[PDB]
Enzyme design. Sequence first.
Site, PDB file in Angstrom:
ATOM      1  N   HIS A 271       0.803  -1.242   0.000  1.00 47.98           N
ATOM      2  CA  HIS A 271       0.000   0.000   0.000  1.00 47.98           C
ATOM      3  C   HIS A 271       0.830   1.284   0.000  1.00 47.98           C
ATOM      4  O   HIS A 271       0.366   2.330  -0.499  1.00 47.98           O
ATOM      5  CB  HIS A 271      -1.064  -0.013   1.100  1.00 47.98           C
TER       6      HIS A 271
ATOM      7  N   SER B 188      -0.774  -0.755  -6.247  1.00 46.55           N
ATOM      8  CA  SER B 188      -0.561  -1.870  -7.156  1.00 46.55           C
ATOM      9  C   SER B 188       0.249  -1.444  -8.402  1.00 46.55           C
ATOM     10  O   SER B 188       0.379  -0.239  -8.685  1.00 46.55           O
ATOM     11  CB  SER B 188      -1.924  -2.489  -7.569  1.00 46.55           C
TER      12      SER B 188
ATOM     13  N   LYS C  89     -15.194  -6.989  -8.411  1.00 48.75           N
ATOM     14  CA  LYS C  89     -14.294  -7.846  -9.194  1.00 48.75           C
ATOM     15  C   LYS C  89     -13.714  -8.975  -8.340  1.00 48.75           C
ATOM     16  O   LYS C  89     -13.540 -10.100  -8.837  1.00 48.75           O
ATOM     17  CB  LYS C  89     -13.167  -7.048  -9.851  1.00 48.75           C
ATOM     18  N   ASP C  90     -13.472  -8.701  -7.051  1.00 50.74           N
ATOM     19  CA  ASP C  90     -12.996  -9.740  -6.125  1.00 50.74           C
ATOM     20  C   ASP C  90     -14.137 -10.675  -5.667  1.00 50.74           C
ATOM     21  O   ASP C  90     -13.904 -11.866  -5.409  1.00 50.74           O
ATOM     22  CB  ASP C  90     -12.225  -9.138  -4.934  1.00 50.74           C
TER      23      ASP C  90
ATOM     24  N   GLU D  86       2.282 -34.442  -3.518  1.00 49.77           N
ATOM     25  CA  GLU D  86       1.129 -33.725  -4.035  1.00 49.77           C
ATOM     26  C   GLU D  86       1.662 -32.793  -5.142  1.00 49.77           C
ATOM     27  O   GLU D  86       2.784 -32.249  -5.019  1.00 49.77           O
ATOM     28  CB  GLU D  86       0.476 -32.914  -2.933  1.00 49.77           C
TER      29      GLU D  86
HETATM   30  C1  HEC Z   1       7.345 -13.296  -3.954  1.00 47.72           C
HETATM   31  C2  HEC Z   1       6.044 -13.829  -4.516  1.00 47.72           C
HETATM   32  C3  HEC Z   1       4.806 -13.512  -3.712  1.00 47.72           C
HETATM   33  C4  HEC Z   1       4.058 -14.454  -3.089  1.00 47.72           C
HETATM   34  C5  HEC Z   1       4.403 -15.909  -2.897  1.00 47.72           C
HETATM   35  C6  HEC Z   1       2.873 -13.814  -2.595  1.00 47.72           C
HETATM   36  N1  HEC Z   1       2.938 -12.463  -2.873  1.00 47.72           N
HETATM   37 FE1  HEC Z   1       1.381 -11.230  -2.711  1.00 47.72          FE
HETATM   38  N2  HEC Z   1       2.258  -9.934  -3.958  1.00 47.72           N
HETATM   39  C7  HEC Z   1       3.584  -9.984  -4.357  1.00 47.72           C
HETATM   40  C8  HEC Z   1       3.842  -8.838  -5.184  1.00 47.72           C
HETATM   41  C9  HEC Z   1       5.186  -8.505  -5.804  1.00 47.72           C
HETATM   42  C10 HEC Z   1       2.675  -8.128  -5.279  1.00 47.72           C
HETATM   43  C11 HEC Z   1       2.505  -6.828  -6.100  1.00 47.72           C
HETATM   44  C12 HEC Z   1       1.625  -7.130  -7.327  1.00 47.72           C
HETATM   45  C13 HEC Z   1       1.211  -6.016  -8.074  1.00 47.72           C
HETATM   46  O1  HEC Z   1       0.633  -5.034  -7.539  1.00 47.72           O
HETATM   47  O2  HEC Z   1       1.231  -6.122  -9.320  1.00 47.72           O
HETATM   48  C14 HEC Z   1       1.690  -8.792  -4.493  1.00 47.72           C
HETATM   49  C15 HEC Z   1       0.335  -8.419  -4.417  1.00 47.72           C
HETATM   50  C16 HEC Z   1      -0.507  -9.015  -3.461  1.00 47.72           C
HETATM   51  C17 HEC Z   1      -1.849  -8.546  -3.103  1.00 47.72           C
HETATM   52  C18 HEC Z   1      -2.624  -7.369  -3.695  1.00 47.72           C
HETATM   53  C19 HEC Z   1      -3.523  -7.821  -4.890  1.00 47.72           C
HETATM   54  C20 HEC Z   1      -2.742  -8.161  -6.037  1.00 47.72           C
HETATM   55  O3  HEC Z   1      -2.822  -9.312  -6.488  1.00 47.72           O
HETATM   56  O4  HEC Z   1      -1.914  -7.351  -6.559  1.00 47.72           O
HETATM   57  C21 HEC Z   1      -2.307  -9.327  -2.085  1.00 47.72           C
HETATM   58  C22 HEC Z   1      -3.624  -9.181  -1.377  1.00 47.72           C
HETATM   59  C23 HEC Z   1      -1.321 -10.368  -1.825  1.00 47.72           C
HETATM   60  N3  HEC Z   1      -0.231 -10.028  -2.566  1.00 47.72           N
HETATM   61  C24 HEC Z   1      -1.421 -11.228  -0.757  1.00 47.72           C
HETATM   62  C25 HEC Z   1      -0.682 -12.374  -0.809  1.00 47.72           C
HETATM   63  C26 HEC Z   1      -0.992 -13.553  -0.028  1.00 47.72           C
HETATM   64  C27 HEC Z   1      -2.153 -13.724   0.930  1.00 47.72           C
HETATM   65  C28 HEC Z   1      -0.008 -14.443  -0.268  1.00 47.72           C
HETATM   66  C29 HEC Z   1       0.029 -15.878   0.236  1.00 47.72           C
HETATM   67  C30 HEC Z   1       0.458 -15.954   1.723  1.00 47.72           C
HETATM   68  C31 HEC Z   1       0.931 -13.815  -1.209  1.00 47.72           C
HETATM   69  N4  HEC Z   1       0.439 -12.594  -1.577  1.00 47.72           N
HETATM   70  C32 HEC Z   1       1.931 -14.506  -1.837  1.00 47.72           C
HETATM   71  C33 HEC Z   1       4.524 -10.991  -4.119  1.00 47.72           C
HETATM   72  C34 HEC Z   1       4.008 -12.276  -3.720  1.00 47.72           C
HETATM   73  C1  LIG Z   2       5.080 -34.889   3.676  1.00 45.68           C
HETATM   74  O1  LIG Z   2       5.327 -35.320   2.352  1.00 45.68           O
HETATM   75  C2  LIG Z   2       4.657 -34.775   1.165  1.00 45.68           C
HETATM   76  C3  LIG Z   2       3.750 -33.724   1.276  1.00 45.68           C
HETATM   77  C4  LIG Z   2       2.928 -33.055   0.175  1.00 45.68           C
HETATM   78  N1  LIG Z   2       2.074 -32.087   0.502  1.00 45.68           N
HETATM   79  O2  LIG Z   2       3.048 -33.362  -1.003  1.00 45.68           O
HETATM   80  C5  LIG Z   2       5.060 -35.394  -0.162  1.00 45.68           C
HETATM   81  C6  LIG Z   2       4.454 -36.797  -0.250  1.00 45.68           C
HETATM   82  C7  LIG Z   2       6.581 -35.408  -0.286  1.00 45.68           C
HETATM   83  C8  LIG Z   2       7.183 -34.006  -0.313  1.00 45.68           C
HETATM   84  C9  LIG Z   2       7.809 -33.470  -1.367  1.00 45.68           C
HETATM   85  C10 LIG Z   2       8.506 -32.145  -1.229  1.00 45.68           C
HETATM   86  C11 LIG Z   2       9.148 -31.642  -2.288  1.00 45.68           C
HETATM   87  S1  LIG Z   2       9.819 -30.128  -1.928  1.00 45.68           S
HETATM   88  C12 LIG Z   2       9.227 -30.180  -0.332  1.00 45.68           C
HETATM   89  C13 LIG Z   2       9.507 -29.134   0.633  1.00 45.68           C
HETATM   90  C14 LIG Z   2       9.196 -29.274   1.981  1.00 45.68           C
HETATM   91  S2  LIG Z   2       9.738 -27.948   2.914  1.00 45.68           S
HETATM   92  C15 LIG Z   2      10.356 -27.145   1.505  1.00 45.68           C
HETATM   93  C16 LIG Z   2      11.110 -25.806   1.542  1.00 45.68           C
HETATM   94  C17 LIG Z   2      11.233 -25.168   0.170  1.00 45.68           C
HETATM   95  C18 LIG Z   2      10.518 -24.828   2.546  1.00 45.68           C
HETATM   96  C19 LIG Z   2      11.301 -24.423   3.603  1.00 45.68           C
HETATM   97  C20 LIG Z   2      10.722 -23.452   4.621  1.00 45.68           C
HETATM   98  C21 LIG Z   2      11.511 -23.050   5.675  1.00 45.68           C
HETATM   99  C22 LIG Z   2      10.968 -22.087   6.715  1.00 45.68           C
HETATM  100  C23 LIG Z   2      10.609 -22.852   7.979  1.00 45.68           C
HETATM  101  C24 LIG Z   2      11.991 -21.005   7.040  1.00 45.68           C
HETATM  102  N2  LIG Z   2      10.190 -27.955   0.316  1.00 45.68           N
HETATM  103  N3  LIG Z   2       8.523 -31.416  -0.104  1.00 45.68           N
HETATM  104  O3  LIG Z   2       7.095 -36.302  -1.292  1.00 45.68           O
HETATM  105  C25 LIG Z   2       8.349 -36.912  -0.933  1.00 45.68           C
END
Ligand code: HEC
Ligand SMILES: CO/C(=C/C(N)=O)[C@H](C)[C@H](/C=C/c1csc(-c2csc([C@@H](C)/C=C/C=C/C(C)C)n2)n1)OC
Lengths: 48, 378, 105, 160, 53, 53, 61, 75
Positions: free
Chosen positions: B200, B204, B226-227, B270
């Site tokens: 904010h 956006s 729209k949402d 998954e």
């Molecule tokens: C690093 C990747 C990334 C992830 C993963 C991500 N965000 Fe964002 N999000 C952004 C960015 C960058 C924007 C800015 C987008 C823009 O305005 O074009 C944004 C925009 C948004 C918006 C404003 C609406 C929109 O789509 O622009 C909301 C609400 C949002 N994020 C919530 C979330 C939520 C809830 C999650 C899941 C916990 C999340 N985001 C996951 C990076 C991400």
């Molecule tokens: C519990 O097991 C499974 C769960 C599922 N939802 O598919 C699958 C059957 C399994 C999982 C695959 C998988 C691939 S990849 C991944 C994973 C787990 S965790 C992680 C990282 C990127 C996140 C780290 C976050 C750290 C914070 C705490 C700081 N990547 N799991 O297959 C072997």
Amino acid sequence: AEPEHDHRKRMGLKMLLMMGLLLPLVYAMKRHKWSVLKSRKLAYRPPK
Amino acid sequence: TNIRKSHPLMKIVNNAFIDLPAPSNISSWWNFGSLLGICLILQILTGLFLAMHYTSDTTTAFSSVTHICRDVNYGWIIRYMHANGASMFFICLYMHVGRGLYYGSYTFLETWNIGVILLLTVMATAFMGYVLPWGQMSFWGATVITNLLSAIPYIGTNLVEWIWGGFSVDKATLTRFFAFHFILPFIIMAIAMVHLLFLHETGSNNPTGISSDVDKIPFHPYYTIKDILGALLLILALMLLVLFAPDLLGDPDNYTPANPLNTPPHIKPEWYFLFAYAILRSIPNKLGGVLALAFSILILALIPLLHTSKQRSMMFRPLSQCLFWALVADLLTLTWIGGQPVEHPYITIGQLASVLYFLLILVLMPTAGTIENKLLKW
Amino acid sequence: VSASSRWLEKIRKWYYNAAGFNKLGLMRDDTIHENDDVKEAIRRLPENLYDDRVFRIKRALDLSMRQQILPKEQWTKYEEDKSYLEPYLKEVIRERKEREEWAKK
Amino acid sequence: GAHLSSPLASIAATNKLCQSFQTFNICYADTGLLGAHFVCDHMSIDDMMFVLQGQWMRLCTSATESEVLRGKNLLRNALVSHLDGTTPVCEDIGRSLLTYGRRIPLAEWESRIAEVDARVVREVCSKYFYDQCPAVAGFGPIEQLPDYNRIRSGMFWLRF
Amino acid sequence: MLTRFLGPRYRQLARNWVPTAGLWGAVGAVGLVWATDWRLILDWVPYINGKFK
Amino acid sequence: MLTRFLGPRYRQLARNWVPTAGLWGAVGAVGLVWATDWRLILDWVPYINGKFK
Amino acid sequence: VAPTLTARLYSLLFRRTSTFALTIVVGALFFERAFDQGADAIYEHINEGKLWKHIKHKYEN
Amino acid sequence: GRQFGHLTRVRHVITYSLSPFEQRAFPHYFSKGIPNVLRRTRACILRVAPPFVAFYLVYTWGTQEFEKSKRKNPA
Ligand code: HEC
Ligand SMILES: CO/C(=C/C(N)=O)[C@H](C)[C@H](/C=C/c1csc(-c2csc([C@@H](C)/C=C/C=C/C(C)C)n2)n1)OC
Ligand SMILES: CCCCCCCCCCCCCCCCC[C@@H](O)O[C@H](CO[C@H](O)CCCCCCCCCCCCCCC)COP(=O)(O)OCC[N+](C)(C)C
Ligand code: HEC
């Protein structure tokens, strides 16, 4: 394995019938609200 | 004057969800942000109502899950709403990150890096989540992933055993994973509100990548409605998946209780972990495998440092568009391969796609931007 | 004759048409990412040019919303593309680099 | 300033929401323009609209008896003050005959004014203002001028 | 993007800050060593001998 | 603290708002009746007879 | 349908937010009845006799 | 955060809007929409489709090479 089988499918029909009524209606709500923007006309009139 | 503007609670809501100056031209691709918020809340309300009847011990873990589906009134819907919402949450995450790349949204440094941390956390959540039923896939998936942490040089074994509560994925681990899976969606929500704070501060981005200060419209009613429409589509996609095909995305092995001796033929994540599983399995080395899996996601933190283009968005960038869809189609490859065994056609092309993911982000798309700049004589 | 230099120019004209900002009435400098140097150069533009810029962006964001483009005749021609920002931004970078040079000694 | 009867005038004065506002009832044969015009600083357009539309709605739904007396009183005073001297009266004869087909005598105006009570105001204000589409014209520093939908939403109340 | 940071002032700025940056590393090392009980490092410390066999 | 709210204007202000306040009660009643399935109230409704014995 | 049914629906019910709400809640109750069993009747036709509700009288005391 | 009246300077742009109650929500839904949707598709098919075809053929070959490998033909 899946006792709920009948119920989910019964609910799924209701969901499909609900969405079939709801989806066009919400779209219509959106369009009418958005129409003020979708028909807006711009004109640039710089001076001199 | 206006009650909705000056009250120290309604004011904060007004400036985030009502009077917010939003771009007039944001795509259906901007809907996933709110749809993530819906997904997060949906997981909380199904999650809690599931946590009410679920037990955390080996002896009763699998049975309580069944008890929910069979005995608990409408428990079967709550159970599948959760399971499908989990991956619905992933499709939105993938749309949302993808949009960020395409449209140059990532240039908002703080808000983007928070989003990466949101991703890791939602994935850390779901990985802990799937273990809870204590099915065959729950256990062996848990076993396959944790064992990777044995590779970290001097610190190796002590770490894995600490996360284990023992020498295998045991009794301790189930209950421990439950506690972490309860808390993490709340931390997610807190990190998601900071995400919205940093956002904010600029407003956006839009499809063009040019600033929209010259054509801002109020978040209500335009983006409220729209949402509202977009959420109806989410419920359609989540509910068709729940009331017609509740196990389409699900692995059948998870329908037999965990056996720490008998290990299944396929170890299938998954779908939302398949691309990452592929990247990991492709590299032979132990240390390198985990470091490539880690790199597969932490790479998004590099993308801003590797913006080379004079334009913000890919909207007017044809070479970059081709290189983007190459990344999507390549990620579609990593997915399919992740859900396949490590036999002949699959070792090679799986390893190949892995190199491509990295060469595409780390080298190829940063070059396209330099060339695209040069063609415009910029 | 300048046969090579007009094909190396014809690729550019091709790319320009493929970029398609011209479909939305835009000029190349209207599409630039606003960083500090750019924000400064936008600031330094004279009234006429700044006003014309705002209109183009408004008209672009308008079409981008209705998911349209302009009629073909009304697109920006590659030849008619006024590079109006470049000297302003050139001067801002030239000024910044002098600062960055002074900060070194 | 602060002590003015009209709530809009007093909120305008206190909060300096405005440099000037005026209501109008412009009449043409079988049609007209009913509403207000104001002039204000860039940051005060929103509040001016809110406070104006809120008063239209207050009057539409909950007009009270004494303020209606003041309205009637201001109008008798306006009508009698205007009709002072040969020029205003000659203008009134000419216009009246062209619009009403006759001169409506002052006692008839008084008759028709005295008939208005709180109920009349709220019935009549609702007829013309309640859930009706405004014509809106803006000029100058108008970034903060509310979107049409928002203006149109101020033409009704969810509580009523 | 990094050529702007190379010149005589930054040479002085690095040297001015290095006794400090070195002493914070000593803080971090002793700090990490003490907190995890790195008997690998701590066995060779003339009083800290909690591994007293 | 309540004597300030009693006088002829408030008499008019209450009467002006009562058809509305009554209709919101009808909304709340029908709303509560419909949502909990108050077969006590709903048995006497000429089409809603889901208790069809 | 003389001054249009939608016009008379607006002037009679939709005008005030109170009667608008009352029309929705009264309407939500009517609609719930006509839809629940009305869609159940369509669910009957696709499963003509394969449901326990149809079998019923085969095992009766 | 930013609010209206503080965003940016804009001069000389008239905007004409209409009430939603005065206009139709779907002016020419199919007579303009369909021409537009093909136009939108043609604009992007050469930029989105070619890697997906390339994936699809790798997918179809790869799976066909998977099964036609473990079965023998001599002793
Ligand atoms: C690093 C990747 C990334 C992830 C993963 C991500 N965000 Fe964002 N999000 C952004 C960015 C960058 C924007 C800015 C987008 C823009 O305005 O074009 C944004 C925009 C948004 C918006 C404003 C609406 C929109 O789509 O622009 C909301 C609400 C949002 N994020 C919530 C979330 C939520 C809830 C999650 C899941 C916990 C999340 N985001 C996951 C990076 C991400
Ligand atoms: C519990 O097991 C499974 C769960 C599922 N939802 O598919 C699958 C059957 C399994 C999982 C695959 C998988 C691939 S990849 C991944 C994973 C787990 S965790 C992680 C990282 C990127 C996140 C780290 C976050 C750290 C914070 C705490 C700081 N990547 N799991 O297959 C072997
Ligand atoms: C958050 C996670 C959930 C995800 C949900 C996503 C799915 C979408 C559904 C979300 C709800 C959106 C509702 C659709 C928007 C329509 C707008 C609606 O709220 O009407 C508004 C006003 O609200 C309604 O008038 C209130 C009616 C109340 C009806 C009862 C609702 C049922 C609740 C039952 C109440 C009883 C309480 C329960 C006791 C136990 C404004 O109406 P408007 O279009 O601008 O017309 C102006 C009004 N006029 C005609 C007078 C000028
Ligand atoms: C109230 C605590 C709670 C919250 C919050 C929560 N869940 Fe769960 N979740 C559970 C419990 C308990 C189970 C085990 C029961 C089950 O499998 O249905 C579980 C099951 C799961 C499963 C296994 C699905 C299956 O049935 O095969 C996944 C995956 C999952 N959750 C992901 C998530 C995600 C993602 C979030 C949101 C970040 C989340 N959950 C929110 C408690 C929670």
